[PDB]
Amino acid sequence: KDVRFEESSSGGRIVMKLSGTSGWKVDRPDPRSAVLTLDNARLPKKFERSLDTSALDTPVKMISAFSVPGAGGKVRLVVAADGAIEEKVSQSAGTLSWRL
């Protein structure tokens, strides 16, 4: 597992690597940040690295990855945002997740 950030004309993009997943996680679009839980996708603390996309002129303040959050086997993603924005999930394949 791992997280990544990039941009396209739609704006800021968060490409997440989900190895060992079948269905889809729980996308929770909040007014502050984003939440993505992956059951049975518990990632190691050695892969919960965060991003530093500060002053990138994007709606995404900064990406933050965190393993444990109080539920066995679950993982969690925190994508801080700012101002009005829209979330768009894309599944180019069974394992690769993206957030435009």
mmCIF file of N, CA and C in Angstrom, residues 10-97:
data_model
loop_
_atom_site.group_PDB
_atom_site.id
_atom_site.type_symbol
_atom_site.label_atom_id
_atom_site.label_comp_id
_atom_site.label_asym_id
_atom_site.label_seq_id
_atom_site.Cartn_x
_atom_site.Cartn_y
_atom_site.Cartn_z
ATOM 1 N N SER A 10 -8.564 18.680 -14.172
ATOM 2 C CA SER A 10 -9.592 18.640 -13.119
ATOM 3 C C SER A 10 -9.030 19.190 -11.766
ATOM 4 N N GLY A 11 -7.712 19.418 -11.662
ATOM 5 C CA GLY A 11 -7.140 19.900 -10.406
ATOM 6 C C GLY A 11 -6.180 18.926 -9.727
ATOM 7 N N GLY A 12 -6.306 18.826 -8.404
ATOM 8 C CA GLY A 12 -5.450 17.938 -7.598
ATOM 9 C C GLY A 12 -5.985 16.517 -7.546
ATOM 10 N N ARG A 13 -5.111 15.597 -7.628
ATOM 11 C CA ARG A 13 -5.358 14.167 -7.738
ATOM 12 C C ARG A 13 -4.566 13.393 -6.689
ATOM 13 N N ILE A 14 -5.213 12.406 -6.079
ATOM 14 C CA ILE A 14 -4.566 11.587 -5.056
ATOM 15 C C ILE A 14 -4.594 10.113 -5.441
ATOM 16 N N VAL A 15 -3.547 9.662 -6.123
ATOM 17 C CA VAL A 15 -3.452 8.270 -6.546
ATOM 18 C C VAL A 15 -3.008 7.378 -5.390
ATOM 19 N N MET A 16 -3.895 6.481 -4.970
ATOM 20 C CA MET A 16 -3.595 5.567 -3.874
ATOM 21 C C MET A 16 -3.392 4.143 -4.388
ATOM 22 N N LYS A 17 -2.368 3.472 -3.868
ATOM 23 C CA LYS A 17 -2.073 2.106 -4.273
ATOM 24 C C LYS A 17 -2.678 1.100 -3.297
ATOM 25 N N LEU A 18 -3.690 0.372 -3.756
ATOM 26 C CA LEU A 18 -4.355 -0.623 -2.921
ATOM 27 C C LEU A 18 -4.070 -2.033 -3.421
ATOM 28 N N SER A 19 -3.104 -2.695 -2.789
ATOM 29 C CA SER A 19 -2.732 -4.054 -3.170
ATOM 30 C C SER A 19 -3.368 -5.073 -2.234
ATOM 31 N N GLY A 20 -4.332 -5.828 -2.754
ATOM 32 C CA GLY A 20 -5.003 -6.832 -1.953
ATOM 33 C C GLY A 20 -6.441 -6.459 -1.642
ATOM 34 N N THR A 21 -7.010 -5.576 -2.452
ATOM 35 C CA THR A 21 -8.385 -5.132 -2.256
ATOM 36 C C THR A 21 -9.268 -5.569 -3.422
ATOM 37 N N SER A 22 -10.539 -5.820 -3.133
ATOM 38 C CA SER A 22 -11.489 -6.242 -4.158
ATOM 39 C C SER A 22 -12.570 -5.189 -4.371
ATOM 40 N N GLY A 23 -13.457 -5.052 -3.393
ATOM 41 C CA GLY A 23 -14.529 -4.079 -3.493
ATOM 42 C C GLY A 23 -14.019 -2.651 -3.477
ATOM 43 N N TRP A 24 -14.815 -1.748 -2.915
ATOM 44 C CA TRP A 24 -14.438 -0.340 -2.838
ATOM 45 C C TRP A 24 -14.519 0.168 -1.401
ATOM 46 N N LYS A 25 -13.596 1.072 -1.042
ATOM 47 C CA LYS A 25 -13.541 1.653 0.302
ATOM 48 C C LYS A 25 -14.710 2.595 0.573
ATOM 49 N N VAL A 26 -14.740 3.163 1.774
ATOM 50 C CA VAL A 26 -15.805 4.081 2.159
ATOM 51 C C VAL A 26 -15.356 5.531 1.990
ATOM 52 N N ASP A 27 -15.856 6.183 0.948
ATOM 53 C CA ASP A 27 -15.507 7.573 0.677
ATOM 54 C C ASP A 27 -16.402 8.527 1.461
ATOM 55 N N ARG A 28 -15.790 9.320 2.336
ATOM 56 C CA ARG A 28 -16.532 10.278 3.149
ATOM 57 C C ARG A 28 -16.060 11.703 2.877
ATOM 58 N N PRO A 29 -16.771 12.397 1.997
ATOM 59 C CA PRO A 29 -16.425 13.770 1.649
ATOM 60 C C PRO A 29 -16.907 14.741 2.719
ATOM 61 N N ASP A 30 -15.962 15.300 3.469
ATOM 62 C CA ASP A 30 -16.292 16.247 4.530
ATOM 63 C C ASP A 30 -15.950 17.674 4.112
ATOM 64 N N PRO A 31 -16.425 18.643 4.886
ATOM 65 C CA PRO A 31 -16.169 20.049 4.596
ATOM 66 C C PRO A 31 -14.750 20.437 5.003
ATOM 67 N N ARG A 32 -14.106 19.573 5.781
ATOM 68 C CA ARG A 32 -12.747 19.829 6.239
ATOM 69 C C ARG A 32 -11.741 18.995 5.449
ATOM 70 N N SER A 33 -11.868 17.674 5.547
ATOM 71 C CA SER A 33 -10.973 16.766 4.842
ATOM 72 C C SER A 33 -11.740 15.576 4.271
ATOM 73 N N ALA A 34 -11.009 14.565 3.820
ATOM 74 C CA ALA A 34 -11.621 13.373 3.253
ATOM 75 C C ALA A 34 -11.300 12.138 4.088
ATOM 76 N N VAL A 35 -12.133 11.111 3.958
ATOM 77 C CA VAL A 35 -11.934 9.871 4.702
ATOM 78 C C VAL A 35 -12.106 8.655 3.796
ATOM 79 N N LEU A 36 -11.135 7.746 3.845
ATOM 80 C CA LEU A 36 -11.179 6.538 3.031
ATOM 81 C C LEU A 36 -10.745 5.319 3.838
ATOM 82 N N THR A 37 -11.704 4.450 4.145
ATOM 83 C CA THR A 37 -11.421 3.241 4.914
ATOM 84 C C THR A 37 -11.393 2.012 4.012
ATOM 85 N N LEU A 38 -10.413 1.144 4.235
ATOM 86 C CA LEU A 38 -10.275 -0.076 3.444
ATOM 87 C C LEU A 38 -10.230 -1.306 4.344
ATOM 88 N N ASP A 39 -11.372 -1.974 4.481
ATOM 89 C CA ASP A 39 -11.464 -3.170 5.308
ATOM 90 C C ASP A 39 -10.487 -4.239 4.832
ATOM 91 N N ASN A 40 -9.787 -4.859 5.776
ATOM 92 C CA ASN A 40 -8.819 -5.902 5.451
ATOM 93 C C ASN A 40 -7.685 -5.344 4.601
ATOM 94 N N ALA A 41 -7.421 -4.050 4.750
ATOM 95 C CA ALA A 41 -6.357 -3.393 3.999
ATOM 96 C C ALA A 41 -5.377 -2.697 4.937
ATOM 97 N N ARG A 42 -5.339 -3.149 6.187
ATOM 98 C CA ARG A 42 -4.447 -2.568 7.183
ATOM 99 C C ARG A 42 -3.037 -2.401 6.628
ATOM 100 N N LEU A 43 -2.602 -1.149 6.508
ATOM 101 C CA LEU A 43 -1.271 -0.850 5.990
ATOM 102 C C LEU A 43 -0.287 -0.597 7.129
ATOM 103 N N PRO A 44 0.985 -0.951 6.902
ATOM 104 C CA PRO A 44 2.049 -0.769 7.895
ATOM 105 C C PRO A 44 2.392 0.702 8.111
ATOM 106 N N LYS A 45 2.891 1.019 9.301
ATOM 107 C CA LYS A 45 3.261 2.391 9.636
ATOM 108 C C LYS A 45 4.416 2.874 8.765
ATOM 109 N N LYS A 46 5.053 1.945 8.060
ATOM 110 C CA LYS A 46 6.174 2.278 7.191
ATOM 111 C C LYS A 46 5.690 2.689 5.805
ATOM 112 N N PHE A 47 4.378 2.836 5.662
ATOM 113 C CA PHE A 47 3.789 3.226 4.384
ATOM 114 C C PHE A 47 2.718 4.294 4.583
ATOM 115 N N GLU A 48 2.602 4.788 5.812
ATOM 116 C CA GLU A 48 1.620 5.816 6.133
ATOM 117 C C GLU A 48 2.214 7.209 5.960
ATOM 118 N N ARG A 49 3.233 7.311 5.112
ATOM 119 C CA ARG A 49 3.890 8.589 4.858
ATOM 120 C C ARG A 49 2.887 9.624 4.362
ATOM 121 N N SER A 50 3.150 10.890 4.672
ATOM 122 C CA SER A 50 2.267 11.978 4.261
ATOM 123 C C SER A 50 2.893 12.787 3.132
ATOM 124 N N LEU A 51 2.074 13.596 2.469
ATOM 125 C CA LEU A 51 2.546 14.427 1.367
ATOM 126 C C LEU A 51 2.870 15.840 1.847
ATOM 127 N N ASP A 52 3.554 16.601 1.001
ATOM 128 C CA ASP A 52 3.925 17.972 1.336
ATOM 129 C C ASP A 52 3.586 18.922 0.193
ATOM 130 N N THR A 53 2.441 18.694 -0.442
ATOM 131 C CA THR A 53 2.002 19.528 -1.555
ATOM 132 C C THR A 53 1.443 20.855 -1.056
ATOM 133 N N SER A 54 2.296 21.647 -0.413
ATOM 134 C CA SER A 54 1.887 22.941 0.111
ATOM 135 C C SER A 54 2.144 24.050 -0.901
ATOM 136 N N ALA A 55 1.175 24.946 -1.056
ATOM 137 C CA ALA A 55 1.300 26.056 -1.995
ATOM 138 C C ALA A 55 1.387 25.545 -3.431
ATOM 139 N N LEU A 56 0.665 24.463 -3.715
ATOM 140 C CA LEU A 56 0.662 23.875 -5.049
ATOM 141 C C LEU A 56 -0.480 24.444 -5.889
ATOM 142 N N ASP A 57 -1.171 25.438 -5.347
ATOM 143 C CA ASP A 57 -2.284 26.069 -6.042
ATOM 144 C C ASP A 57 -3.374 25.050 -6.363
ATOM 145 N N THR A 58 -3.723 24.234 -5.373
ATOM 146 C CA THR A 58 -4.752 23.215 -5.547
ATOM 147 C C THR A 58 -5.711 23.195 -4.364
ATOM 148 N N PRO A 59 -6.890 22.589 -4.567
ATOM 149 C CA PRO A 59 -7.919 22.486 -3.528
ATOM 150 C C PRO A 59 -7.514 21.537 -2.403
ATOM 151 N N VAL A 60 -6.483 20.738 -2.654
ATOM 152 C CA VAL A 60 -5.995 19.786 -1.664
ATOM 153 C C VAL A 60 -4.868 20.387 -0.833
ATOM 154 N N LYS A 61 -5.162 20.679 0.431
ATOM 155 C CA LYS A 61 -4.173 21.260 1.333
ATOM 156 C C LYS A 61 -2.942 20.365 1.435
ATOM 157 N N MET A 62 -3.160 19.108 1.816
ATOM 158 C CA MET A 62 -2.069 18.150 1.954
ATOM 159 C C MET A 62 -2.607 16.753 2.251
ATOM 160 N N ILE A 63 -2.002 15.748 1.632
ATOM 161 C CA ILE A 63 -2.416 14.366 1.832
ATOM 162 C C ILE A 63 -1.729 13.756 3.051
ATOM 163 N N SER A 64 -2.492 13.000 3.836
ATOM 164 C CA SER A 64 -1.957 12.362 5.033
ATOM 165 C C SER A 64 -2.442 10.921 5.148
ATOM 166 N N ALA A 65 -1.497 9.993 5.264
ATOM 167 C CA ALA A 65 -1.827 8.576 5.382
ATOM 168 C C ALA A 65 -1.631 8.092 6.815
ATOM 169 N N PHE A 66 -2.592 7.318 7.312
ATOM 170 C CA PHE A 66 -2.522 6.784 8.665
ATOM 171 C C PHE A 66 -3.038 5.348 8.712
ATOM 172 N N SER A 67 -2.281 4.472 9.364
ATOM 173 C CA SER A 67 -2.664 3.072 9.482
ATOM 174 C C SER A 67 -3.752 2.889 10.534
ATOM 175 N N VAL A 68 -3.370 2.635 11.783
ATOM 176 C CA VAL A 68 -4.357 2.323 12.809
ATOM 177 C C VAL A 68 -5.340 3.465 13.035
ATOM 178 N N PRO A 69 -6.623 3.102 13.190
ATOM 179 C CA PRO A 69 -7.569 4.157 13.604
ATOM 180 C C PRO A 69 -8.664 3.546 14.484
ATOM 181 N N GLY A 70 -8.350 2.422 15.151
ATOM 182 C CA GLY A 70 -9.241 1.914 16.178
ATOM 183 C C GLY A 70 -10.160 0.795 15.733
ATOM 184 N N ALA A 71 -10.020 0.356 14.496
ATOM 185 C CA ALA A 71 -10.817 -0.748 13.965
ATOM 186 C C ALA A 71 -9.858 -1.794 13.401
ATOM 187 N N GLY A 72 -9.973 -3.035 13.882
ATOM 188 C CA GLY A 72 -9.133 -4.093 13.313
ATOM 189 C C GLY A 72 -9.222 -4.127 11.792
ATOM 190 N N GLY A 73 -8.080 -4.336 11.161
ATOM 191 C CA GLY A 73 -7.876 -4.567 9.743
ATOM 192 C C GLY A 73 -8.145 -3.358 8.836
ATOM 193 N N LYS A 74 -8.749 -2.289 9.316
ATOM 194 C CA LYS A 74 -9.131 -1.124 8.534
ATOM 195 C C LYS A 74 -7.965 -0.185 8.323
ATOM 196 N N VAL A 75 -7.978 0.560 7.219
ATOM 197 C CA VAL A 75 -7.042 1.683 7.024
ATOM 198 C C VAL A 75 -7.790 2.982 6.725
ATOM 199 N N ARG A 76 -7.049 4.090 6.890
ATOM 200 C CA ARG A 76 -7.723 5.380 6.824
ATOM 201 C C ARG A 76 -6.868 6.406 6.087
ATOM 202 N N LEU A 77 -7.519 7.266 5.314
ATOM 203 C CA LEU A 77 -6.816 8.299 4.560
ATOM 204 C C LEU A 77 -7.382 9.683 4.872
ATOM 205 N N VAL A 78 -6.489 10.647 5.070
ATOM 206 C CA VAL A 78 -6.898 12.014 5.371
ATOM 207 C C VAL A 78 -6.378 12.989 4.323
ATOM 208 N N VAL A 79 -7.291 13.524 3.515
ATOM 209 C CA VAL A 79 -6.923 14.473 2.470
ATOM 210 C C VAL A 79 -7.494 15.857 2.763
ATOM 211 N N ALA A 80 -6.751 16.650 3.528
ATOM 212 C CA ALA A 80 -7.180 17.994 3.879
ATOM 213 C C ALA A 80 -7.459 18.824 2.633
ATOM 214 N N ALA A 81 -8.523 19.622 2.683
ATOM 215 C CA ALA A 81 -8.899 20.469 1.558
ATOM 216 C C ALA A 81 -9.183 21.895 2.013
ATOM 217 N N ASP A 82 -9.567 22.748 1.069
ATOM 218 C CA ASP A 82 -9.872 24.141 1.372
ATOM 219 C C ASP A 82 -10.912 24.699 0.407
ATOM 220 N N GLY A 83 -11.703 25.657 0.881
ATOM 221 C CA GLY A 83 -12.725 26.255 0.047
ATOM 222 C C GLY A 83 -13.628 25.225 -0.599
ATOM 223 N N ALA A 84 -14.503 25.679 -1.490
ATOM 224 C CA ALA A 84 -15.429 24.783 -2.174
ATOM 225 C C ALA A 84 -14.687 23.880 -3.156
ATOM 226 N N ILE A 85 -15.038 22.598 -3.154
ATOM 227 C CA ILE A 85 -14.407 21.631 -4.044
ATOM 228 C C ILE A 85 -15.304 20.417 -4.252
ATOM 229 N N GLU A 86 -14.891 19.528 -5.152
ATOM 230 C CA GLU A 86 -15.658 18.325 -5.444
ATOM 231 C C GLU A 86 -14.752 17.101 -5.494
ATOM 232 N N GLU A 87 -15.244 15.983 -4.973
ATOM 233 C CA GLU A 87 -14.479 14.742 -4.959
ATOM 234 C C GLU A 87 -14.909 13.823 -6.096
ATOM 235 N N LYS A 88 -13.938 13.180 -6.734
ATOM 236 C CA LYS A 88 -14.216 12.270 -7.839
ATOM 237 C C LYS A 88 -13.310 11.045 -7.782
ATOM 238 N N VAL A 89 -13.897 9.899 -7.456
ATOM 239 C CA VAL A 89 -13.144 8.653 -7.367
ATOM 240 C C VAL A 89 -13.093 7.949 -8.720
ATOM 241 N N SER A 90 -11.942 7.366 -9.034
ATOM 242 C CA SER A 90 -11.762 6.656 -10.296
ATOM 243 C C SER A 90 -11.043 5.330 -10.079
ATOM 244 N N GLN A 91 -11.594 4.263 -10.648
ATOM 245 C CA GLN A 91 -11.004 2.937 -10.513
ATOM 246 C C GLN A 91 -10.543 2.406 -11.866
ATOM 247 N N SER A 92 -9.278 2.642 -12.189
ATOM 248 C CA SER A 92 -8.711 2.189 -13.453
ATOM 249 C C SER A 92 -8.428 0.690 -13.422
ATOM 250 N N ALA A 93 -8.572 0.091 -12.243
ATOM 251 C CA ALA A 93 -8.331 -1.337 -12.082
ATOM 252 C C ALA A 93 -8.622 -1.782 -10.652
ATOM 253 N N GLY A 94 -8.823 -3.096 -10.467
ATOM 254 C CA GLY A 94 -9.112 -3.676 -9.153
ATOM 255 C C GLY A 94 -7.906 -3.632 -8.224
ATOM 256 N N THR A 95 -7.652 -2.460 -7.649
ATOM 257 C CA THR A 95 -6.527 -2.306 -6.742
ATOM 258 C C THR A 95 -5.978 -0.894 -6.735
ATOM 259 N N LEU A 96 -6.141 -0.189 -7.849
ATOM 260 C CA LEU A 96 -5.654 1.179 -7.968
ATOM 261 C C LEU A 96 -6.785 2.179 -7.759
ATOM 262 N N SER A 97 -6.670 2.981 -6.706
ATOM 263 C CA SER A 97 -7.683 3.983 -6.391
ATOM 264 C C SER A 97 -7.162 5.390 -6.671
#
